[PDB]
Amino acid sequence: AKVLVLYYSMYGHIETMARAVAEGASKVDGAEVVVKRVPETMPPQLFEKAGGKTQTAPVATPQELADYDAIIFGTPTRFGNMSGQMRTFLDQTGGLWASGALYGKLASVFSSTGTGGGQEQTITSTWTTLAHHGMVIVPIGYATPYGATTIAGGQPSQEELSIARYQGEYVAGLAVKLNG
Amino acid sequence: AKVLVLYYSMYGHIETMARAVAEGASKVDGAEVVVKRVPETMPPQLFEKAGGKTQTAPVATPQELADYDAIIFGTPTRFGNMSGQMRTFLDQTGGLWASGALYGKLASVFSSTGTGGGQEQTITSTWTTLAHHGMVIVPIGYATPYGATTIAGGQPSQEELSIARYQGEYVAGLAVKLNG
Amino acid sequence: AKVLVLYYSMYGHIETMARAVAEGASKVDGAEVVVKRVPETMPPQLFEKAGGKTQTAPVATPQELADYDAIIFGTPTRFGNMSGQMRTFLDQTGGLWASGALYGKLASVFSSTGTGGGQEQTITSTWTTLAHHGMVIVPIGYAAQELFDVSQGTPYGATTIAGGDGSRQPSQEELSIARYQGEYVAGLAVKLNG
Amino acid sequence: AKVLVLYYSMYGHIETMARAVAEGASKVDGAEVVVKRVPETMPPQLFEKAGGKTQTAPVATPQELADYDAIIFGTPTRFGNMSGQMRTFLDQTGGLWASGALYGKLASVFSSTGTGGGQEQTITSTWTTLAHHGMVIVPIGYAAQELFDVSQGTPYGATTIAGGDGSRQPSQEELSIARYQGEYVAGLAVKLNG
Ligand SMILES: Cc1cc2nc3c(=O)[nH]c(=O)nc-3n(C[C@H](O)[C@H](O)[C@H](O)COP(=O)(O)O)c2cc1C
Ligand SMILES: Cc1cc2nc3c(=O)[nH]c(=O)nc-3n(C[C@H](O)[C@H](O)[C@H](O)COP(=O)(O)O)c2cc1C
Ligand SMILES: Cc1cc2nc3c(=O)[nH]c(=O)nc-3n(C[C@H](O)[C@H](O)[C@H](O)COP(=O)(O)O)c2cc1C
Ligand SMILES: Cc1cc2nc3c(=O)[nH]c(=O)nc-3n(C[C@H](O)[C@H](O)[C@H](O)COP(=O)(O)O)c2cc1C
Structure with missing residues (x-):
């Protein structure tokens, strides 16, 4: 079975978590695991001004999500929603939605937060x-x-x-269990 | 695999839907399907005053939920929540929660509503x-x-x-697929 | 303005919170505050056996919610929903709903958890x-x-x-x-009601 | 009181709704209403190619939200969330958050869907x-x-x-x-702000 760990991180917390998720998935015999990020949408100038941690994982396209049996999505808590970068990326999955390409596949979510709540x-x-x-x-x-x-x-x-x-x-x- | 269709209905709409859900589940070879209701909490006097449709399906206990591989829950829309009767019943599943008895089993939900919204x-x-x-x-x-x-x-x-x-x-x- | 602190508590945590909510509300001159609870639905024997806490607050009726300008609702977290007792009580507010009795009135919510999960x-x-x-x-x-x-x-x-x-x-x-x-x-x- | 109707629209449905929201708000004497949009994030070529609708409304900055007493937010339904454009814009309101700039101000939301699902x-x-x-x-x-x-x-x-x-x-x-x-x-x- 093919497992994608797909994440957005600005300051590295979700990046660290994504590595741990991937490690766990890799414990399972027959699971082929890959880690990718969604694009940063901020111009580098603005990302740097904000003190971002430059991400180096391969960038996913919206359309390749179809290739996996399970997708584990990571996003920071942004006022009790996913980040704009993850939202932007998911708003580009309309072509998959119309084709039913993700139907029935496994999905799971992890998050990072400060101490203000909103992660649920x-x-x-x-x-x-x-x-x-x-x-x-x-x-x-x-x-x-x-x-x-x-x-x-x-x-x-x-x-x-x-x-x-x-x-x-x-x-x-x-x-x-579902896909061999 | 064992499938429970577990429902609350006051006026029969979820009851009708539960029969349809059960029919669909029964199309699957190897699925053993049963339909049960959660208890009515209203005294019969009050249920009758409100024009309720008396339910005749066998009544589930909270603890028997553990016996099934999949549970498909039906509830009317009650101001954008499940009904008090379903909530009361689920508040009696603390013993299962502590024991992990439902962990990993399949769950799905259906609903009935008027035209005011709230079903989502x-x-x-x-x-x-x-x-x-x-x-x-x-x-x-x-x-x-x-x-x-x-x-x-x-x-x-x-x-x-x-x-x-x-x-x-x-x-x-x-x-x-998951349980044979 | 009339403020109702309406709560459900089994073991007293929301009760203590409700009293604090009412204390704060009482600081506002011109706010008349009252604390009421929704009925317990568990038979007294099972409630007592479970270690439930008996409570001084008067029991609210659904109808009387119409009489307030603001209602502050307290419920424990029950698997990320309100309690069955609060849900049962709110399911009895259909008449109020149909007449618009609560339209435009202020509402706010407080909760309690065992270990944090589900409060939001x-x-x-x-x-x-x-x-x-x-x-x-x-x-x-x-x-x-x-x-x-x-x-x-x-x-x-x-x-x-x-x-x-x-x-x-x-x-x-x-x-x-x-x-x-x-x-x-x-x-x-x-500010809204004098 | 100053009311901002702040919206995102790709194909004009929320834009038409926003204009209606503003019309209603304008009925209230003593409400100063303005309509603004959040920036489009799609490159103009891709937006035009997708059949996107160009729009007269001025583009809001995150900072200016502080200047209003009420903000009515419009977004299309995008798989049961706000749009990426509105989410990106709201993710730029961290400075406002830290200063308490929007605390206590009124907020309300309107939406649009293709076929109904996810609006709630x-x-x-x-x-x-x-x-x-x-x-x-x-x-x-x-x-x-x-x-x-x-x-x-x-x-x-x-x-x-x-x-x-x-x-x-x-x-x-x-x-x-x-x-x-x-x-x-x-x-x-x-009523709250004069
Ligand atoms: C615009 C914005 C909104 C945020 N909202 C919340 C929030 O609702 N609750 C919270 O506790 N932390 C909030 N945070 C903090 C992030 O969730 C937190 O820093 C997280 O660790 C960052 O993950 P990352 O390092 O992978 O980017 C917010 C951060 C930003 C930039
Ligand atoms: C207290 C109460 C609240 C309700 N809230 C809603 C609601 O939020 N939205 C709606 O459209 N219908 C609402 N309804 C109507 C029921 O969802 C609807 O009648 C449904 O078909 C009943 O299912 P049943 O026949 O299985 O009891 C409500 C009904 C009751 C009694
Ligand atoms: C059926 C049931 C489910 C519960 N679910 C949760 C829960 O989701 N998260 C949690 O941390 N505690 C949970 N609790 C603990 C309650 O939230 C806790 O008993 C309550 O906050 C105490 O408030 P009270 O003393 O006012 O009743 C649950 C308790 C019961 C009885
Ligand atoms: C990525 C994407 C996801 C969408 N998701 C939904 C949806 O969950 N439910 C729905 O009925 N329509 C959905 N739509 C249709 C939009 O809600 C529709 O295009 C929008 O309401 C039109 O508003 P606008 O003209 O202001 O852009 C989606 C559209 C896009 C582009």
Whole structure:
């Protein structure tokens, strides 16, 4: 089974989490795992002004999402929604939606946040979009039950990285169960 | 695989939909399907005063939910939430939650509504609870993409019953794919 | 302006929060505050057996919600929704809905959790129902720090942690946010209604 | 009171709705209404190629949102969220957030869909962001029928159906609800702010 870890990160927190998710997924025999990012939409000038951490993962196109059996989406919490960069990217998946290309595939979500709350709303409002594509949504339950998170007030903790690894391992296991 | 269609209905609309969901699930070879209701919480006197349609399906206990591979939950739209009767019933599943008994099982939701809106919110706020139990959530996508619905202003339509049948068939098929 | 603090509590955490909300609201001259609870639906024997807390607050009827300018709703988090008791009570407000009785009145929400998860969803899924009634929804955001009566969660409404075992009680930091929420909502109610 | 109607539209449906919202708001003496759009993020060539509609409204900056007493946000439904363009714009309001610039101001939301699905989620997931800013959220409920300027969807905010092909335009029934939403919100803004 093919598993995509698809993420947006500005300051590296989701990037770190995405590596952990990928590690967990890679524990599952028969899971082929790849990590990609959505494009930065900010001109580099503005990204640098804001103190961003330049991302180096390969950039996904919206159309290649169709190639995977499971997609695990990472986004920072942005006032209780996904980031504009992830939203912009998902707004480019209209051609897949019309073709039913993601229908029935597994989806799961992880997030990063400060200490102000909103991470639950970010995850569940991301689920909405996944459901429009007919994706099967995988929460983590009481291994937020909605998906792995990292909370930075002011680097993810050991325990946060372990829950992220679990989410990857669990989703990848389901992907192999459904798809070989 | 064992599929439970678990519902609350006061005026029969969800009851009719539940039969359609069950029919669809029963199309799948290897799916064993049962339909049950959650208890009415209103004293019969008050249920009758309100013009309720007495329900005759076997009543589920909260604890038996653990026996199924997939649970398809039906609730009317009640100001954009599930009904109090379904909420009361799910508030009695604390013992299952602590034991992880529903973890990883398939869940899906259907609803009934008037013409005032709220059905999307009813379905997605039901998903939240399912996710606390670690259930895998199955939307219907563009077969609301969130689950089958029936809309009665002032009996479900042929097309509404067909989408409900589809939801049962699709969920049951996944249940057999995952569980034999 | 008349402000109702309407709550459900099984083990007393929301009850303590409700009292704090009412204390804050009472600070506003010209706000008449009252605290009421929704009925317990569990048979008394099962409630007592479960370690439920008996409570002094009068039991509200659905009809009387019409009599207030602002209603501040408290519910524990129950798998990311309001409690069955609060949901059952709100399902009895159909007559109010049909007459427009709550349209335009202020609403705000506070909650409690065992270990944190689901609080956000409890509050926002309660907002949905308030919106069907046409109520104006008041989140708390992150208020100016000098407006809290203690120096120093979510922007959706005040919350408190009960612990996995339910034995934790609200801290003064949590209660201060609850008091702020009451004061803020009551102030708005007086501004709109005298 | 100053009311901003801030919107995103690709094919003009939200634009037409925004104009209706502004018309309604303009009915309120003492409300100064303005309509602005968030920037298009698509390169002009791709936008034009996609059949996008060019628009007269001035482009808002994030900073200027601080200058209004009420902000009525319009966005099409994009898989049950606001558009990437509106989300990108709101992600630039961090400075406003930190200073409390929008705290306590009125917010309300309107939308559009191709075939209906997801409108409710678009509106309520936009409310989430408004709540992080501490804005007071105004749903429309089901208003008294005599307040609509046409005789005769959701209680969350006004919406309109564009059709699967995008060729449907808002009906006078839909626009009447949009006009009501503007009038209602502007009235509240004047009541709170003069
Ligand atoms: C515009 C904006 C909005 C934010 N909103 C929230 C929020 O709602 N809650 C919160 O606690 N943190 C919020 N944050 C902080 C980010 O979620 C947090 O810094 C996260 O770790 C960043 O992930 P990244 O390093 O992968 O970009 C926000 C940040 C930005 C830039
Ligand atoms: C308290 C209450 C609240 C309701 N809220 C809504 C609502 O939010 N939107 C709507 O269109 N219909 C609403 N309805 C109507 C029911 O969703 C509708 O009648 C449904 O068909 C009933 O399903 P049943 O026959 O299975 O009980 C509500 C009904 C009740 C009793
Ligand atoms: C059925 C049930 C479900 C619960 N769900 C959650 C939950 O989703 N998240 C959580 O942290 N605590 C959960 N709790 C703990 C309650 O939120 C806790 O008992 C409550 O906040 C205490 O408030 P009270 O003393 O006012 O009843 C649940 C409790 C029960 C009985
Ligand atoms: C990427 C994308 C996703 C969309 N998602 C939905 C949707 O979830 N539900 C729906 O009925 N229409 C959907 N639509 C149709 C838009 O809602 C429609 O184009 C919009 O309402 C028109 O508003 P506008 O003319 O102001 O851009 C989508 C359109 C795009 C481009």
